[PDB]
Amino acid sequence: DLSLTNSSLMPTLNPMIQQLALAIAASWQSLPLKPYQLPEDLGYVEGRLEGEKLVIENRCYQTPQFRKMHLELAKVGKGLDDLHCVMFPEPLYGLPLFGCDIVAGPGGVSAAIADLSPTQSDRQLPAAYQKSLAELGQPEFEQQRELPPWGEIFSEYCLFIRPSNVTEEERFVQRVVDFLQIHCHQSIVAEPLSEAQTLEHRQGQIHYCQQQQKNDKTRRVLEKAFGEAWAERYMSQVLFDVI
Ligand SMILES: C=CC1=C(C)/C(=C/c2[nH]c(Cc3[nH]c(/C=C4\NC(=O)C(C)=C4C=C)c(C)c3CCC(=O)O)c(CCC(=O)O)c2C)NC1=O
């Protein structure tokens, strides 16, 4: 399932989304993957109420270091495209949370967000991450976006932009590839932590999922195609499940 060649959505998504989906899949392809079963063994889902149809493709995996690796592609009607990805770490290893959300319409990408988010109580990334991320240097983008109020969960390296041209699209993709290369290497060298530290990282992941559920822009997309009760179950059990 991890080849995207069987995807029905891929050919119709915004090109930046296609490039990022491919890069994520390439990063995961040779890991010690096992399937992760979403609620009701959800793969493909389509729904419509009174407006536009929402189509969603889900792929989910797990490894010893990552309890849940979720790649979701979505399209609303013919306008709105979305790529959503979260690698949820196993708290035992103390790794940060990789996440990204890319939203596009007919006139281009409106929102591109990626981060390696902290799970420590002091809201800092592990020292090895800080060092590696600082060495990449700060990227220059013309149109930055300020994080909403629930976005206190994001690191100081969080990127949130509207890409202004294809060069910036490519620059953002390359920065996400760099984040993934750092993250995959740190996962090899990570050691199992003490019970007390595992608990702190668990709490940090819970908090991340609770704050992400406050994103009303995501919720309203789901609500308009499936209704309020479906949307709440999807947000809380599929996208941002509390462990
Ligand atoms: C069904 C799945 C799914 C859909 C439909 C979705 C849609 C979605 N996500 C966002 C913004 C959107 N997404 C995020 C961030 C994230 N969101 C995440 O799922 C993750 C992992 C991050 C961060 C790593 C932020 C911070 C914002 C801006 C929220 C705002 O402007 O209020 C928008 C508003 C775009 C804009 O303002 O230009 C939409 C429609 N996101 C999804 O995940």
Author numbering: 5 to 247
What sentences appear in the manuscript?
Although Ile86 is not a catalytic residue, its mutation to aspartic acid (I86D) disrupts the proton relay to BV. Thus, the reaction stops, and in I86D, similar to D105N, (an) electron(s) is/(are) donated to BV. Glu76 and His88 showed different hydrogen bonding with surrounding residues compared with WT PcyA, further explaining why D105N and I86D have much lower activities for phycocyanobilin synthesis than the WT PcyA.
PcyA, a ferredoxin-dependent bilin pigment reductase, catalyzes the site-specific reduction of the two vinyl groups of biliverdin (BV), producing phycocyanobilin. In the case of PcyA, three residues, namely, glutamate, histidine, and aspartate (Glu76, His88, and Asp105 in Synechocystis PcyA), present near the D- and A-rings of BV, are essential for the PcyA reaction. Here, we performed neutron crystallography and quantum chemical analysis of the D105N–BV and I86D–BV complexes to determine the protonation states of BV and the surrounding residues and study the correlation between the absorption spectra and protonation states around BV.
